[PDB]
Structures are given as C-alpha cells and as structure tokens.
Amino acid sequence: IINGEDCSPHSQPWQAALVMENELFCSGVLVHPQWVLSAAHCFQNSYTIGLGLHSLEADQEPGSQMVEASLSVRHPEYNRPLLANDLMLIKLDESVSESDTIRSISIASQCPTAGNSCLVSGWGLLANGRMPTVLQCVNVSVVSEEVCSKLYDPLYHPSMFCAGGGQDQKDSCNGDSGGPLICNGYLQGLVSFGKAPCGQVGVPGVYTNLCKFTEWIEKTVQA
Ligand SMILES: NC(=[NH2+])c1ccc(N)cc1
Ligand SMILES: [Co+2]
C-alpha cells in the first residue's frame, strides 16, 4: 500500500495472506467459509493461507489460523486478453469457522461508480519501497471508465477498473496483488496490476471488476 497507514487490527477480517517458502507474495479475500478469492496471477500448486492476521507473525496473533489448500480454479479466460479476467477461487482443505477476527465478506453485485471512495489493504511494498510489518489500509476513489480505458488502452478490458491515481499518491503496489478493494462494505475488486512505479499522479491502479464474475464465482463456489 502506498501512502496508507496501519489498519485497525482485525478491521478487515476477510483479508487472507498467501505465503510461500517463508514470505508473503499475495493476498485473497475470504468470500466463503471454504473459499478464498484472489488474483489469477497468484496461482500456485499449493497455498499456505493465513486468516485472522494483522502481522505476518502468525504466532503473535490470537484468532489467527494458518490453513492449507491446493485446489485452485483460475477463471477460464484469464489473461485473454493480456492481463484480463485476473481472478481465481482457492478451495481451502478444511472449511474455517467465522471467528471474531476472521469473517467472510460479500462480493458487490453492482459495478464501481466513479468518484466513489473505497478502501484497499495489503502487506505490499510501501511508499519507501519497504514491506510493512502490519496490514496496510488506504483509500482510493473509483476513476471513470472513460479515463480508465483511455489511460490503459489497449490493455483495458471490461473485467477491470481503475481506482486512485489522485494527487495524493495513494495506491496499491507490489505484494498487494489479490488484495481487497471494498466499497460501501462490499468486495468491489481485487488488486490486479498498474504502471510502475506505484503511486504516480494521474496513473490509477487496475483492479479486477468482480461485479462482472458473480455468476462464475457462484457456480464455482457452490457446484
Ligand atoms: N501500483 C499498483 N497499483 C500495482 C503493483 C503490482 C501489482 N500486481 C498490482 C498493482
Ligand atoms: Co491482534
């Protein structure tokens, strides 16, 4: 997160951390007791998801649960066109129990509205190019479709949307991929990509436009 601040511990209970050998590489959103939503470009053969965290130090966070999973379903059209449909559902081995610091969030069924201010959180790089010790939070506003599509032509696709890009230099960044973007308490998008460096004025970040994959997310999680 660029130019944000330490989130209020456990203020985003749907936040899922994805760690590899021993480091964080992505995030996900608990959209169901046994399913974590994330960016297709975060696919692995097996994940080590951390729920209920705030600091990466799992054994320092109470209600925290380091579950495991291996069945991941990337969206059929991911990366066709280049970079598009960047979402993926990861099915957790053992379903988790919604605790005090671990709750799932629902996906917005309506589409981003320009100007609307939202929040995004993650453990990605900071304004100083450094990784944070706790989960970061920042607000960015939805940018209009016109500006988005022209700014990111010809890579822009309807499965994406822009947010931020303001003068305040608030934005996501590397390590926040698959992170959540909440709008009025709904999961509006996932941290997907954007120009580098991050936090450039006039250059918003791109997020997966979840409002567009409700039916798929459903047919998958359920059936
Ligand atoms: N700066 C950004 N909004 C960004 C950087 C890496 C990435 N995967 C996604 C987005
Ligand atoms: Co805590």
Side-chain angles (χ1 to χ4, degrees), residues 206-223:
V206 189
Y207 295 86
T208 310
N209 198 17
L210 304 163
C211 79
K212 298 289 198 180
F213 305 102
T214 49
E215 179 167 306
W216 182 79
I217 304 179
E218 218 57 78
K219 185 156 196 176
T220 290
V221 165
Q222 201 61 215

Side-chain angles (χ1 to χ4, degrees), residues 127-168:
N128 42 50
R130 230 306 142 189
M131 295 295 257
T133 34
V134 294
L135 179 58
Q136 293 305 276
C137 260
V138 80
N139 286 81
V140 292
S141 307
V142 178
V143 173
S144 63
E145 189 177 322
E146 174 177 12
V147 168
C148 191
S149 59
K150 291 179 173 178
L151 254 180
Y152 272 98
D153 185 314
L155 278 184
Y156 163 89
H157 178 67
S159 58
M160 35 183 134
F161 70 94
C162 296
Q167 198 105 49
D168 56 21

Side-chain angles (χ1 to χ4, degrees), residues 107-127:
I107 295 160
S109 78
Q110 235 191 37
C111 307
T113 70
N116 207 284
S117 167
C118 303
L119 166 101
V120 27
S121 54
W123 292 271
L125 280 80
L126 299 176

Side-chain angles (χ1 to χ4, degrees), residues 2 41 152 171-177 191-199 204-207:
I2 300 297
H41 79 261
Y152 272 98
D171 179 43
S172 343
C173 200
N174 302 52
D176 295 327
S177 284
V191 173
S192 192
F193 71 90
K195 285 164 187 165
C198 316
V206 189
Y207 295 86

Side-chain angles (χ1 to χ4, degrees), residues 27-206:
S27 293
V29 178
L30 196 54
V31 288
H32 175 289
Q34 218 178 188
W35 291 108
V36 160
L37 188 45
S38 189
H41 79 261
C42 279
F43 172 105
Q44 303 285 293
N45 288 303
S46 64
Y47 317 91
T48 318
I49 302 164
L51 294 169
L53 296 156
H54 179 71
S55 71
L56 295 184
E57 278 274 53
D59 64 305
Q60 287 198 182
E61 292 293 344
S64 79
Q65 275 178 64
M66 301 295 248
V67 313
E68 279 178 34
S70 56
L71 192 192
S72 15
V73 178
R74 301 205 304 291
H75 183 290
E77 314 303 335
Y78 165 56
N79 209 268
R80 307 273 292 102
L82 179 62
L83 301 186
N85 310 106
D86 190 2
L87 65 168
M88 152 192 87
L89 284 164
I90 297 185
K91 186 166 181 165
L92 303 152
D93 281 345
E94 153 204 350
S95 156
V96 288
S97 293
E98 292 183 5
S99 96
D100 216 306
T101 59
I102 295 184
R103 187 173 74 233
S104 83
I105 180 157
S106 31
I107 295 160
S109 78
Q110 235 191 37
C111 307
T113 70
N116 207 284
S117 167
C118 303
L119 166 101
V120 27
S121 54
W123 292 271
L125 280 80
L126 299 176
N128 42 50
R130 230 306 142 189
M131 295 295 257
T133 34
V134 294
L135 179 58
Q136 293 305 276
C137 260
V138 80
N139 286 81
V140 292
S141 307
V142 178
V143 173
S144 63
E145 189 177 322
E146 174 177 12
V147 168
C148 191
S149 59
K150 291 179 173 178
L151 254 180
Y152 272 98
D153 185 314
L155 278 184
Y156 163 89
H157 178 67
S159 58
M160 35 183 134
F161 70 94
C162 296
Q167 198 105 49
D168 56 21
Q169 280 157 286
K170 293 187 162 188
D171 179 43
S172 343
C173 200
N174 302 52
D176 295 327
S177 284
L181 180 74
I182 316 309
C183 290
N184 297 149
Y186 287 78
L187 175 62
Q188 195 79 232
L190 293 157
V191 173
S192 192
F193 71 90
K195 285 164 187 165
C198 316
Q200 299 182 215
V201 176
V203 199
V206 189

